[PDB]
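Build the 3D complex.
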Amino acid sequence: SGVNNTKKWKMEFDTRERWENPLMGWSSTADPLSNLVLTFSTKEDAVAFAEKNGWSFDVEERKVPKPKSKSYGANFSWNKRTRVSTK
Amino acid sequence: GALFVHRDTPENNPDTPFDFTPENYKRIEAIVKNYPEGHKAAAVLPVLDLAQRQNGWLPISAMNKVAEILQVPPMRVYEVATFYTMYNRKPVGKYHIQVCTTTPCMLRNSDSILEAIQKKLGIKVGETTPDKLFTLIEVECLGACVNAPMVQINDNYYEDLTPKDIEEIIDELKAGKIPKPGPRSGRFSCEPAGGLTSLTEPPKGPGFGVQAGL
Amino acid sequence: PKKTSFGSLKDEDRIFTNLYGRHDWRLKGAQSRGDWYKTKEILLKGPDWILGEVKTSGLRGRGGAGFPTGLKWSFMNKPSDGRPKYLVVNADEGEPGTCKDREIIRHDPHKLVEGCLVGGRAMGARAAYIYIRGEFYNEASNLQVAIREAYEAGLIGKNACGSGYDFDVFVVRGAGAYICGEETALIESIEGKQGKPRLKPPFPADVGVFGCPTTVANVETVAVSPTICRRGGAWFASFGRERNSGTKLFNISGHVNHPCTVEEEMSVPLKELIEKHAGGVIGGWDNLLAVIPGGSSTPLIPKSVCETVLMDFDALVQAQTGLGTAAVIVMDRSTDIVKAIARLIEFYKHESCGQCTPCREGVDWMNKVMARFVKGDARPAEIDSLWEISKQIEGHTICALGDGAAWPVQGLIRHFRPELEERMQQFALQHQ
Amino acid sequence: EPFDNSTYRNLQHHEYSTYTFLDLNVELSKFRMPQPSSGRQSPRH
Amino acid sequence: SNLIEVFVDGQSVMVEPGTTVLQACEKVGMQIPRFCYHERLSVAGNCRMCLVEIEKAPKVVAACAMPVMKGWNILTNSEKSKKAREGVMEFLLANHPLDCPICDQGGECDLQDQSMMFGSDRSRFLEGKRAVEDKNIGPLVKTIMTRCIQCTRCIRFASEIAGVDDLGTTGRGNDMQVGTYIEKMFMSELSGNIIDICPVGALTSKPYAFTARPWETRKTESIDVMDAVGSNIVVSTRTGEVMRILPRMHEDINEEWISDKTR
Ligand SMILES: Cc1cc2nc3c(=O)[nH]c(=O)nc-3n(C[C@H](O)[C@H](O)[C@H](O)COP(=O)(O)O)c2cc1C
Ligand code: SF4
Ligand code: SF4
Ligand code: SF4
Ligand code: FES
Ligand code: FES
Ligand SMILES: [K+]
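Done.
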């Protein structure tokens, strides 16, 4: 339920193939750019980095919460059906 | 045991046959009529009490039966059964012995009441007698700490008990005779031994404090 | 304009004039005892008159709340808002020591239902849901006899006492859970739910039982209402000091000479009251260790401080103890105090519902570390820890049971510290 | 006729039946003024 | 308008009347610690973890269910609020069984991370603990009821959201247990959702159980295909294979709940 991670934009890439090693079985990869999670305060700065070293990029909108109309007095009622059977 | 989980007992599981008596059927109709419509689920408390008293202890098949006739989910009435103190989920004896050993009553030497009763029956606190008559469990007060030591027997509680008196009343119950509940002395409820500080003079009559059009 | 003569109140001034049920405890002799007479007229005279009478009287929360009767009745007088307003009278009385109400329902149940109808006019409601405890099934039937004749003559129900006002009350039984005595755990039991105390808001004036306004008052508030309205609130307020006035039933009990239910005047020096009520503490005040005049959820006071204190809600909390329901429990030197709280905390452990965390595992913790206290498996620091633990469970609980758990044990830490200090020192001393 | 201080007038504390509360309640059902309609049959309804 | 200005810990911000304290705190960004409160679910006010001290009050106000008044200073970092936070936090953690290395919630546990920030650095418990019988329901969700903190979020997300009567709170006090009493097998289409709502490892996913842990996984988001809804989901590749599916929050399509056939 913690929220102190959905506050920053990041630069992440597409995932290439991950072949199992002929030996004990480590996931050998040849994608150097895969492990490149960057940080960004705002999307405007995020795209600014993307265009400054011109890179084929796409956008995404910040997941914004909606208004939770909460009323603990609602949970008990006479002609309203939001009465809760067990707390 | 105090195990609040149904271990699918061979007899007290859903296969148990339960039937409200037609007299109890109209009686529980009166219970439902007590509470407003739209919230008839309020009868999970007394109807369960009827389901207990009708069949001694409260069977689980009753817990499933009461769910539908009161149009409540089964888990909900289970919650009432599993919380509200006595509500015997498992079979109980004829005389549900509730020994009041809480602090005010314990301070009045209800300890000797507990051990002597437990010893004269032989059975430990908990399980019922082999003749399913007496089942003793230590509980907190029935609401008479003003009175001397107290024990709730079956559905009735005896007051003003004595380390000697409490055995006598219940061995009478063992032998079939039923002594009357309440204080076991001249005390009607809890009147002082020295005298009657309260209710000594006749009570006031009518016609007092007439504030104009009172 | 002063009442320095605090104490010595007679039966004619006790609210429950027949609290022992010596003369026609039902309403048949009660109409000859003053009540049910001139009752509908004061009912119709004014809803604010009813709260005015209880405000002039000035009873404050004698069922362990400390809240004036006028305040809780006045929050109610809002006009009927479609949802059907009710009354609910807490009659659980499951607190160890609370038994004075258990006596009067057997002896004065008429004023219980009569106080409802007059008190119920104060909000313009229509019915009520007196919650008499399951162990009080005998009490419940006594109410039922009282309410049937009230229904038959119109005293309760439609045409309340002959005024045309439609107000009734349904007597329902409990199931012996002391928590259902909580003003908020009371709601669920009435509407058929596990008695887990609710939160405020919504208040009794707002959404309550069945999601509608409903007073959750104690036995006293309705019971006193016929006496402090028709006879007069000034008559009751004449006895007692400011705010805390009049008389309340005193539950002199415990290991005492003559444990009785006496409705002696309140706001009086506690010394001579329980010295004369039960002919004095058995063995004397000298042999006494600690009387607790509030009951379970009230700090035990050592014998020396009991000798110098007044029992009113103000003076007792000046001595850091509570008065609550005036459950006067006596416990003398022979019995060990750690054993006294041993049974007290055990009662609280078996009555917590576990809804809010600080009470659920908290009251479990007090019993466990105190169990070490009784035998003596602790250290003087551990006394500080349990006081620190008692601080944590103070207030943080949903209801006041967790707070009510602190008061008795917290009083012990401040008062009987050397008794605890010798208790766990002896165990280690002679163990070696 | 007059008040007497040495009687237990509440002998019901010692004598009753098994079903006391509800057979008096089915008698109570006579008056039992009609309760307000909540519209819905229950919170689920 | 009717918007009410509240000077939360200084800074003053307007808010609609009837709004509880948490919404005011998160309006600034004050993530107030909570266990039994989830955004799209009824309020319990049970954990007492969101107890924060309000100004000009002799008591700590239960911010969970309490609405905001006309002007109030939420003492977020005050000693009284932190004292209330510390008291209840070790309270929940007291009877918690010592199976963090065993419980799958390790690294994704609210009871773990909250104790790092809002928690003590030692213990004061000397007595024993309480162990609960593990209720057995479903071949799809695993119950370790000794780890349960009785936040009752499962029972509310069941009866309100799933709209099915499945779980209860049988018992009383320390012995009250969340379960079905009589044995059953809770079977809803969205039954695989209570795993995420559970703040602790009391309820975990049987197939993913004992297979992977947070820091190994590199979450990748996508949508569900098993239904025409197209529920937004989070994939949990660890080293080249998919472990578990998380219901990415988007509100319109799936909120943050996905049915069993998708996870
Ligand atoms: C822990 C606790 C237990 C209580 N138990 C009872 C009880 O058993 N019976 C009762 O009548 N009131 C009981 N009360 C009091 C009620 O909560 C409440 O004060 C009552 O409904 C109204 O009291 P008043 O009329 O004196 O204001 C209890 C209160 C608390 C905090
Ligand atoms: S303090 Fe105890 S009785 Fe009150 S709500 Fe919390 S757990 Fe229940
Ligand atoms: S749920 Fe309990 S056992 Fe599991 S990681 Fe969290 S604290 Fe540890
Ligand atoms: S099982 Fe999980 S969700 Fe349910 S009450 Fe326990 S901790 Fe809360
Ligand atoms: S103290 Fe023995 S009855 Fe309550
Ligand atoms: S989260 Fe607000 S009380 Fe549990
Ligand atoms: K979980």
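Residues 186 and 193 of chain B are 9 Å apart (CA to CA).
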